[PDB]
Structure 1
């Protein structure tokens, strides 16, 4: 599981800026924090994890001060349109192991990370960042706080989320599939489409088949989100008209027990 906190800050000029944040645990949103809101909003029953109200309030306060300081520091540095994104969190591995990260992009490009005990520019980042990053590193209060958040608080908080959020994280939702076709660009050919929607979790197997034989022309699309915390995917096959007979789409998913969906064209 990758836990990520995403910050999106836009500065249009000296007197217009906003920052919005969202937080994900794998593919499930756990928090939102609008520019218009003083406080971080929960998007799950279990968004506080195992933290007490006191621990949560202390954490939220730290972020409230950060959001204000960050905006002031950027407007100060700029002495437009500027887009800054920050992605921070941790990847949780089997056996209580984790790895934390904090990356920053400027104008859509990765330029800075926090690594170990300091802020570092990435090779290729513009040279004008070297000095402000130096100055930032002089702020040992901030460096120590970031170290604690990354090394300590992040994995601790996520362990709690994983417990508290068990019934959602471990949910199984069954795919429903259906078949369609369109003419292809190419006289006498058709594109067959197998649509698979409503499944959770994400891992799925979808193949066009002729009997036991996988059709290697099967072209899987991207995973597309539904609005109800389930997934959508389609897989297409270009066929010569005539050759359509005998084809099936087969889908395997954890929620199906061990009974694959097979639809026949």
Structure 2
């Protein structure tokens, strides 16, 4: 059970006059922090979002991020005029660590351009030529390279360790799924698509399969894990069936929260 900390940044630049920066933090699958552009403060979403960190340790990081946001915006506009890059600009930052390695990845226009490796910035394997010129400028900033190295290797590992302990009760929580059936018409004539919805389960792993007797139907199509507003998951498994061959069909659901008790839903 791994719970990596993902610090996400979304910075957009429409013109030389308009710019937004919004951020957030993920511990596993739970969002722990919200950093709105309109706020001078990184908002905590949970009672244990600070972890072991005292309020004084937390305000230190608070001011650092506040300076970073204003400085990041300035540098990008400077890099735009310098490297002769046209607006609009889209930048995304993915940073954080997992306690048992750390990472810093930035992306330009949805594509990787550079990352922070060791003690300096390095361009990605697939990266345009102008990136190397930006790296040369970034690497001259000795204070930033020391601060990032101090945050990723010093501040982050102690912070995640503080989060996992202070919020072990919510991270290891178990929510029971609820299932129901429906049927939309199929693309082919004489066929029907049965849908088995599964919602409200946590954690993510779950097992859904359409059944006849003890025989698993390989025609079952598992969907994607869709999120709910209450930090639970939604999932549906479909099955195309002929008209008249719908009898005997059942949807079986297995989840860790049920304690070895299957959820069975026979059709009609």
TM over 0.5: yes
Aligned 1:134-145 pairs, distance under 5 A: 134-145=136-147
Question: SS where residue 37 of structure 1 aligns?
Answer: coil
Q: Distance in 2 between matches of 1:240 and 1:155?
A: 56
Q: Distance in 1 between matches of 2:58 and 2:111?
A: 32
1:86 equivalent in alignment to 2:88: no
| Residues 29-80 of structure 1: per-residue CA shift (max 9 Å, x gap) | 1111111111100111111111011110111111111111111101111111
In the alignment, which residue of structure 2 is the partner of 1:235?
237
In the alignment, which residue of structure 2 is the partner of 1:31?
33
Gaps of 5+ in 2: 82-86
In the alignment, which residue of structure 2 is the partner of 1:210?
212
In the alignment, which residue of structure 2 is the partner of 1:41?
43
Question: SS where residue 14 of structure 2 aligns?
Answer: strand
CA-CA distance at 1:113 after TM superposition: 0.7
Q: Distance in 2 between matches of 1:34 and 1:183?
A: 43
In the alignment, which residue of structure 1 is the partner of 2:127?
125
In the alignment, which residue of structure 2 is the partner of 1:73?
75
Gaps of 5+ in 1: none
- Report if aligned partners of 2:92, 2:106 keep a CA contact under 8 Å in 1: yes
In the alignment, which residue of structure 2 is the partner of 1:224?
226
CA-CA distance at 1:26 after TM superposition: 1.1
CA-CA distance at 1:123 after TM superposition: 2.1
Question: SS where residue 196 of structure 2 aligns?
Answer: strand
Say which of 189, 192, 208 aligns to 2:191: 189
Question: SS where residue 78 of structure 1 aligns?
Answer: helix
Q: Distance in 1 between matches of 2:58 and 2:125?
A: 37
Aligned 1:160-171 pairs, distance under 5 A: 160-171=162-173
- Report if aligned partners of 2:178, 2:198 keep a CA contact under 8 Å in 1: yes
Q: Distance in 1 between matches of 2:125 and 2:27?
A: 30
Q: Say what the alpha-carbon RMSD is for the aligned residues.
A: 1.0
| Residues 175-232 of structure 1: per-residue CA shift (max 9 Å, x gap) | 0000111120111111110000011111100000111111111100000001011000
Q: Distance in 1 between matches of 2:264 and 2:155?
A: 46
Ranges of 4+ aligned residues in structure 1 off by more than 4 Å: none
